[PDB]
Design a protein around this ligand. Structure first.
Ligand code: MG
Ligand code: MG
Ligand code: MG
Ligand code: MG
Ligand code: MG
Ligand code: MG
Ligand code: MG
Ligand code: MG
Ligand code: MG
Ligand code: MG
Ligand code: MG
Ligand code: MG
Ligand code: MG
Ligand code: MG
Ligand code: MG
Ligand code: MG
Ligand code: MG
Ligand code: MG
Ligand code: MG
Ligand code: MG
Ligand code: MG
Ligand code: MG
Ligand code: MG
Ligand code: MG
Ligand code: MG
Ligand code: MG
Ligand code: MG
Ligand code: MG
Ligand code: MG
Ligand code: MG
Ligand code: MG
Lengths: 112, 63, 247, 50, 91, 77
RNA sequence: UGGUGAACUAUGCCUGAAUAGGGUGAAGCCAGAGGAAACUCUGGUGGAGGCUCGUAGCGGUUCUGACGUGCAAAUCGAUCG
RNA sequence: UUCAAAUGAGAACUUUGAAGACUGAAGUGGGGAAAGGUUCCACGUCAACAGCAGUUGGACGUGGGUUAGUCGAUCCUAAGAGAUGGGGAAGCUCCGUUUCAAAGGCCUGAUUUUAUGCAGGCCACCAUCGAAAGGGAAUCCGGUUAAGAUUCCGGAACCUGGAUAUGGAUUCUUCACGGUAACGUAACUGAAUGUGGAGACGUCGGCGCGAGCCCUGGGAGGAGUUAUCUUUUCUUCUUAACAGCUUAUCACCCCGGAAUUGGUUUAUCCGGAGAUGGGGUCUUAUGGCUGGAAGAGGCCAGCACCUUUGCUGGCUCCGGUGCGCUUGUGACGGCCCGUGAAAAUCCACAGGAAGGAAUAGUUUUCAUGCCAGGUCGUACUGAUAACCGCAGCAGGUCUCCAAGGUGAACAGCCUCUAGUUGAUAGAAUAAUGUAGAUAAGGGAAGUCGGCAAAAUAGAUCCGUAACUUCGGGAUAAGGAUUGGCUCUAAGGGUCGGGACGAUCAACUUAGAACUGGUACGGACAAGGGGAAUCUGACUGUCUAAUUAAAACAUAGCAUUGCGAUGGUCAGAAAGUGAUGUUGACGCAAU
């Protein structure tokens, strides 16, 4: 069976020197150097993969338009839309509780 | 090819022709995985067709 | 006639500590105005393993009082501290596990950890897993506090020195036998080059005071005085006694 | 090494241009006493040590 | 079926290191690999990441605990002492 | 390379003031049952991309050929 | 007395790479049996171990084999770990 | 190794043909890293060199040959190295790497004869060196040379930096709209500052999927065998980067409200913190179709032929199979007192500073269009002859690809592709050798000693003692079977449907008959075992080149010092260091 060689001068099986065997229009087998696979962007709060964000190597994010990199929502391409919902609910409830707390303090400061 | 045809007909498979253990020739885990996958496929098929209900399905799945 | 192993350790060439994978020095916040007069609230983001350290580390975020940003601090995690917990550090902070308080702000019998020897040194006492300092008394006249240290020693510290309520997490670690050489190997490759150990009596006289002889034996008293010099201090240095305690 | 510095390549170029026999007309010069290239270097005999 | 009479999880060690050492290791490995109740979500889903680190597979809460058990007895006594002292100071 | 399915788009593309050459390629696609037919490919050389329009009908093929601009240098096969 | 060496080798660190096919069958899990209670037992599943037979690799036990002005200032063959 | 021819003064050794062999894909093949340096290739050529010879050559003489925006270096940081401030040292210099230092550069106003003038903060990061295997912007296919190619030619792409117009989009509700939602899109303003993500990570195990390969059916060509048989044996039937559409395990959303608990993996996890179910959303690993692209490449058939050397035509298609091999990947699971880099770099979000509205009023991460991409390396070997070993030395020297059969198998043995047929030869078969073997009867009587050799050996089924830390001992011990051929049985996937039938597909296991000079793990391959004593617990390590062990280490046990103004250790000194990114469950010494 047709055997292949590395096409660069790196002769070692490093993770930057990974290949796959392809067949060319010339009918022969050849090595094809494959780049390292990209990691999905993760949420800043929970760490889960962000839905609707393209998976590219970091420099490739400078090539694509904004649509591939964000979602139409607050914290679009940085938080996971359950953490955003949790942020909204926590903010509203704690702000209301702060109003309640200062009303209680103003009430209990009138005891004397 | 002629030898392969004979092997498919059942020849050359006696005790004097085996040199690896039975496990080495065909893993017992592979045999079990085939059997259990057949059983689970059948149980799911029967539940989805309605020949058995989910309670009988669950008992048969466990056993 | 040769420089011995314990002498060679001080040049620190192959005997330095292996620090590549470590999370950073674990220390309290820099003692500032906020901790000095009130309290400041931080949030526990992570409880992470630290290479070469038995105890886990808590990673706590505080707001910077003077600039708009967040400051990360690497605390040694106390038992019970969890991610998402609020930590309170300061003079007016509450007496809860994980909070950082001056030693003068806690009653006698309080269990604290990562105790400062002097106020502002950011933690020096009771740092290993399962260790703690007991607050045993106060002297408000001289602004001092008596404590019991893990070694059983009694100590007097400034009442402004800080500590963390609770006990260092990870206790009971040394209760498990290693069972084999490889586990000690992996334990020390994350710490330093101190393992395995060759016995001095297995060496030649050129290498060790215990070296040589037609039998393996020390041949002279192994209790070495304080005034001995480098190359002589091999054995039981300044031993007040030897032998098995209580017969 | 097939990945060589320019400095190594320049030394190799000088050695290549030096690797030649004595020009024949030198021997015909008046009062000539040079009979051969006494500094002749070959890759199989002596290494040039960078 | 019963696969071992008494070695349990320490059957991985065969016959070496001695019975007493293997029994000592057995108790702590059973503790260390056990699943624990999550005080936050109420599920049997807390397992050890590394010595002293106890993570719940759901709700993702991580708590600092003992090297081989979620909570040591000394830690429980410390919590009771701190609660007693705090309530005494408040009262 | 990019495929174009809209003949109107192809028409505007043939007069883009940077496109200078085009190639008309004829492919025989013969089978007993489906179709023994004659397919034409109009390839326009843009500055950055080659645009191919595939037409499976000879009537449209000749109409496009006579609709091609005169300034466009066309190669056959 | 003043200099030069860790291209060999010793040890640490940093960054990479490499290691067929078999034997045995730990925990966890599922089903079942016996028992008045304690509780005991079986069949599967699973795939642990500084386990084991054994390739590549690493090493170097014996022949006290070859060689011993050698292929070689330490190698060759078989047997071995 | 052999025969013949050619060349040559001369041929065992050169060349060609023929034959016989070998490496047998962890190669005697195809590439590379270090190293070498022209050894590469051509022409001429044999005085010296080549373990003989030589017309040949890694020799000798003369020349030719290495083409990059995309492959590397160059950039980043790693363990580290090292200036400056400052301190020490008679001094050569030493410490230290952010320090006890007054240690700098961003946007915006900008009259663009021209560079600035005052503005108001912006962190306080301290030089720099350190990887041709770590990180990292971007290229593929076909062709082409005596010798170069991911670099040349042809075609087809991509990135970065810059410039810049048109179209589209948006705006009189100024900075888009749709979807309940997960989110969608051709776009769809956004300074300081902050936050987050990617870069970015162990190992092993089974399972799923992909790719290349292996195997195989039909057909369209070519070659071989053809006394006989053989719808036969061999061979060609290919599709790159890039682009558009589409395609997913996981994850998530909407409805709903679950005990008769259900769903479900090979592996038992999940569900009122909302399961099953119904319907949706998303990542695009990966595959499919299309473009690239048949015009290329491959295989053939007819004419012409060194007239630059061709011309013309046809086909290049459709399937199947899997515990297969190699490799990539996903979701998981095991393990740790081990939890398995950093930085450059890119992006997003939060925030709201400024700026912006009607025959060209802003902005455009949308499309198209314009320009440029420097420097150095690039030949060849990579070893039984291109490196090191005094040499053309049986030694040593990192790594990628890996066909068929047998077989558990990357074992051994045989073969295909590729490569080689090199190592002084001819004749003859004394002693003694070296290597390989055989042996009547006896069976360790040999010898210090069973040294050496022999015996055993695979697989299936039986059967396994003392002792034991209950895990083992154990393949204990000790027995039976095994070929070929002809069959039989069991073990499945889809689809029909609304109790089976029809189709498709492997190789495991078991049984029976027959058969033979009772042979059959038929070559290859492949444990001797038992009863005890001494000794070291075990696995592991060392005297490179006479000692592998009972020696060293080891877990376990015990003792000693020390709470930092410290213990132990370093330095000539120091405003100097190691432990120490440490703190008694620790470090240090035994
Ligand atoms: Mg790299
Ligand atoms: Mg197998
Ligand atoms: Mg099994
Ligand atoms: Mg020792
Ligand atoms: Mg000795
Ligand atoms: Mg003495
Ligand atoms: Mg040499
Ligand atoms: Mg070295
Ligand atoms: Mg082993
Ligand atoms: Mg020896
Ligand atoms: Mg000898
Ligand atoms: Mg040898
Ligand atoms: Mg010859
Ligand atoms: Mg000669
Ligand atoms: Mg040559
Ligand atoms: Mg020459
Ligand atoms: Mg590059
Ligand atoms: Mg650099
Ligand atoms: Mg070449
Ligand atoms: Mg080109
Ligand atoms: Mg080149
Ligand atoms: Mg090359
Ligand atoms: Mg080469
Ligand atoms: Mg020979
Ligand atoms: Mg005999
Ligand atoms: Mg006999
Ligand atoms: Mg005798
Ligand atoms: Mg005797
Ligand atoms: Mg023997
Ligand atoms: Mg025995
Ligand atoms: Mg030795």
């Amino acid at each position: 069976a047709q055997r292949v060689t590395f096409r660069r001068r790196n002769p070692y099986n490093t993770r930057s020197n990974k290949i796959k065997v392809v067949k060319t229009p010339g009918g022969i087998l050849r090595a094809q150097h494959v780049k390292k696979l990209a990691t999905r962007p993760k949420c800043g709060d929970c760490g889960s993969a962000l839905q609707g964000i393209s998976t590219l190597r970091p420099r490739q994010y400078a090539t694509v338009s904004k649509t591939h990199k964000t979602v139409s929502r607050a914290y679009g391409g940085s938080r996971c839309a359950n953490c955003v919902k949790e942020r909204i609910i926590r903010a509203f409830l704690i702000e209301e509780q702060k109003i309640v707390k200062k009303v209680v303090k103003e009430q209990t400061e009138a005891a004397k | 090819r002629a030898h392969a045809q004979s092997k498919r007909e059942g020849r050359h498979s006696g005790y004097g022709k085996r040199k690896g253990t039975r496990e080495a020739r065909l893993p017992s885990q592979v045999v079990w995985i085939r059997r259990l996958r057949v059983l689970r496929r059948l149980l799911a098929k029967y539940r989805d067709a309605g020949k058995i209900d989910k309670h009988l399905y669950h008992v048969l799945y466990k056993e | 006639g040769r420089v011995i192993r314990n002498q060679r350790k001080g040049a620190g060439s192959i005997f330095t500590s292996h620090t590549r994978l470590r999370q950073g020095a674990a220390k309290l916040r820099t003692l500032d105005y906020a901790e000095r007069h009130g309290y400041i609230r931080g949030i526990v983001k992570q409880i992470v393993h630290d290479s070469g350290r038995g105890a886990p580390l808590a990673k706590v975020v505080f707001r910077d009082p003077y600039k708009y940003r967040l400051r990360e601090e690497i605390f040694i995690a106390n038992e019970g501290v969890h991610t998402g917990q609020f930590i309170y550090a300061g003079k007016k902070a509450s007496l809860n596990v994980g909070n950082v308080l001056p030693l003068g702000s806690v009653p006698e019998g309080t269990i604290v950890s990562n105790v400062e020897e002097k106020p502002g040194d950011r933690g020096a006492l009771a740092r290993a897993s399962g260790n703690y300092v007991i607050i045993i008394g106060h002297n408000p006249d001289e602004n001092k506090t008596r404590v019991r240290l893990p070694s059983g020693a009694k100590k007097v510290i400034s009442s402004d020195a800080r500590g963390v309520i609770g006990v260092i997490a990870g206790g009971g670690r040394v209760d498990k036998p290693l069972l084999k050489a490889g586990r000690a190997f992996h334990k020390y490759r994350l710490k330093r080059n101190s393992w395995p150990k060759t016995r001095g009596v297995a060496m030649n006289p050129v290498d060790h005071p215990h070296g040589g002889g037609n039998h393996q034996h020390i041949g002279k008293a192994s209790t070495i005085s304080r005034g001995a010099v480098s190359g002589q201090k091999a054995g039981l240095i300044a031993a007040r006694r030897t032998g098995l305690l209580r017969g | 090494a097939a990945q060589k510095s320019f400095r190594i390549k320049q030394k190799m170029a000088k050695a290549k241009k030096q690797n030649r026999p004595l020009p024949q007309w030198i021997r015909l010069r008046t009062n000539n006493t040079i009979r051969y290239n006494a500094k002749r270097r070959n890759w199989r005999r002596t290494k040039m040590n960078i | 079926a019963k696969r071992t009479k008494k070695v349990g999880i320490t059957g991985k060690y065969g016959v070496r290191y001695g019975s007493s050492l293997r029994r000592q290791v057995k108790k702590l490995e059973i503790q260390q690999h056990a699943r624990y109740d999550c005080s936050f979500c109420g599920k049997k889903t807390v397992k050890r990441g590394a010595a002293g680190i106890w993570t719940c597979s759901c709700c993702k809460k991580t708590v600092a605990g003992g090297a081989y058990t979620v909570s040591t007895a000394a830690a429980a006594t410390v919590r009771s002492t701190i609660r007693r002292l705090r309530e005494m100071v408040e009262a | 390379a990019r495929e174009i399915t809209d003949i109107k788009q192809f028409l505007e593309l043939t007069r883009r003031a940077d496109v200078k050459t085009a190639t008309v390629k004829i492919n025989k696609k013969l089978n007993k049952a489906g179709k023994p037919f004659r397919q034409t490919k109009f390839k326009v050389r843009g500055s950055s991309s080659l645009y191919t329009l595939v037409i499976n009908d000879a009537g449209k093929a000749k109409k496009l050929i006579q609709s091609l601009p005169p300034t466009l240098k066309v190669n056959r096969l």
